Write a protein that binds this DNA or RNA. Sequence first.
RNA 1: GCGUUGGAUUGUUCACCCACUAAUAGGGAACGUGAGCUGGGUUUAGACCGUCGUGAGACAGGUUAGUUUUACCCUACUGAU
RNA 2: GAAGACAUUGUCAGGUGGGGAGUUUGGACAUCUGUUAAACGAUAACGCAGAUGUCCUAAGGGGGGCUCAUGGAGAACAGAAAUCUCCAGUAGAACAAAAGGGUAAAAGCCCCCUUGAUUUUGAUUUUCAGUGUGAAUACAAACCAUGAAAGU
RNA 3: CUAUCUAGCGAAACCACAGCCAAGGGAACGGGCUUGGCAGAAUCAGCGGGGAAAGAAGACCCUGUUGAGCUUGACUCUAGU
RNA 4: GUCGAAUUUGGGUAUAGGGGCGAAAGACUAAUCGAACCAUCUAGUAGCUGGUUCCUGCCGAAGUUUCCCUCAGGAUAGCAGAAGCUCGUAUCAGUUUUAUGAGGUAAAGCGAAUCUUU
Lengths: 137, 100, 85
Amino acid sequence: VRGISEEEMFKVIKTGKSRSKSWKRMITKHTFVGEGFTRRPVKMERIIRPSALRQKKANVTHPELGVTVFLPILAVKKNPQSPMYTQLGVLTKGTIIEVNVSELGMVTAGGKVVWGKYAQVTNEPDRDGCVNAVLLV
Amino acid sequence: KYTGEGFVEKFEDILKGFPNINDVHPFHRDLMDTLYEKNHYKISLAAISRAKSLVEQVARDYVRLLKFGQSLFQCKQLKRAALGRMATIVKKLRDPLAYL
Amino acid sequence: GTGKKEKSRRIREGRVKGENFYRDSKRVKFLNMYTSGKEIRRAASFQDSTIPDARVQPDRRWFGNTRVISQDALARILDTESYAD
RNA sequence: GCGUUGGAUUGUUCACCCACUAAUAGGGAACGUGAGCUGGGUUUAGACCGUCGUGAGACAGGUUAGUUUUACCCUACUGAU
RNA sequence: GAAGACAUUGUCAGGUGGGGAGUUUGGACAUCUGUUAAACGAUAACGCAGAUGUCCUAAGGGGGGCUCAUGGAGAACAGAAAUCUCCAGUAGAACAAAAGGGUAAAAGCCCCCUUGAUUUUGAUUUUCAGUGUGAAUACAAACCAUGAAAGU
RNA sequence: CUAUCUAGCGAAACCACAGCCAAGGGAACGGGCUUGGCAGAAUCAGCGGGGAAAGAAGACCCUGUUGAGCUUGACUCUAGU
RNA sequence: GUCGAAUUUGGGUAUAGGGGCGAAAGACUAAUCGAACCAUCUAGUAGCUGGUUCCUGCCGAAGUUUCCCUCAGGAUAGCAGAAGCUCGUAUCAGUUUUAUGAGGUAAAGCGAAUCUUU
């Protein structure tokens, strides 16, 4: 993981008629936004998560059996480089996300069924719209 | 976008040209049944129609993701990933093209 | 005059610059966010332009199942004749 | 070497049709070209509506109104003794 | 005609008083452990992962006793899961807390006595202009605590 | 009707020095420096490429322990009541 | 645009600077108005810009320390000149050699630990 500056992934949005209101910031990197999101008002918000940079699903490769499965993301548990981007959801590299496993149907101790795992992303999604995540075994 | 249209204008030259074996005439359908094997004929052309729509999806995403590139070292990578994922569709389509 | 002073009002009811009889004590930090992002020549807020330390420590309380769900709760002709045949 | 157009909708290039044509190729010159033009749009003071503020006022914003005006100088270039 | 020891006026006193007057509306700042830091020391960045504006009459002193984390083999209940007991155990435990040191007949765990957490003012160390503040170390004069004693 | 030519009359802006280019280095895009291309007196009418020609110690953006105007339960007071 | 009236205009007269007057633009008040003009206090203050007038000889720097509502500036230390004083080979030195200290970095090592046994 290389160090990500805070001067990137935040854009000076100068608002108003005379462009002098350097207040607002926009995340220029990718974000999981949640299932029920319903954006805050524009007068009320400060931080902006755009519409195009919202990956819901991610390519989940598995080291055991060597199978890449296209699975949806449910939660973002651990984000490096602050605890602040955990709440936001910036998904650069090394971000451990909580990915369901429903199509695989794995059997646990007692065999109830496993429906979710933890997977760590491995590439910057700025370079491609794919989000590749190695499921930790 | 210009490469993205470049693959489609070749694919629109395939899906328009081939004689659309269902509803031609029950004779011309049925010479081509024995000689060209309707199953392999209809599957390969429908593979390209799947391969045409995936080029439109990648082109409409990587123009839309590219509008927030804040530097040159980021906008270059979205160009290369947009051409690579189109080349993946072409290399995968290597076997139905030689049949056609 | 003598009553409507900051020192004589707070004794009646029971620190951020700009607290008045009006909005609140909490609204002053809130309504100053409209002018918050400025750099003073101290860089601007939420743009620190610095590289942090991004370490992921190994924990045994990972690598496992997330919660639970129970048993109680829940051809190809390209195989035969490929293309040239 | 030579040639690459005529129109239709927004200040608009951005983005896309209609027809002709042999063809409607791509670029540069301070993203050519304001002391050539344009002021259509970019930036004051007038005024309204919307959001926020107790208030003066600022804007997530929208609409309308609106002053920079040499050349006779040396060079360059087109002509002239 | 009306009004009358009240109004009015004078001087002090409380209430009100942006209608008005004067002026203002700051630029990782005080610190300790690790690392960046490259075998004396010093060394930066809006470097970095973390702590502090407290806490305790004992969690301060002094003396006596004793061994911890952990594993093996066993005891009606009682099992992996209290108590008992032995074998191995350089500390893998613990000490008010961040972090780095240091610690086994102890600086830990248990008991016995206590107030040196006192009085008088100097010398010295750290940041340093070798100024202050803070904190610290070694002495002298007392007066004490403790211990059989040295000593502390 | 001017411009143009003539008789009479006859100013101003601006001005360090002044005036032909390419390339190289360079306060980040030379009229002068360095290596090249060149270069013949004196000049008249047009012209608007350049001379960062000129209108503004800049309307734009930061600083100052510099102001002024306006507002409010900012501080300190005051006429009045 | 308006042109018989909320019309246009002469003379007289009234209101004067934190005041006037305004069918309201912060408009107008002698080419001057988000506070007129005149003279004095006044040579107001500037941590900001510009300028600072003769020649030769000798020596010759700093952008660094700690503190400051300190960051275009001060105070302190450093570096520099000048005046010299006590003495006269002298204590010395941006250096080696002999002896003896302290280090834990590159390498080595994971059949060392988990970040130092050497």
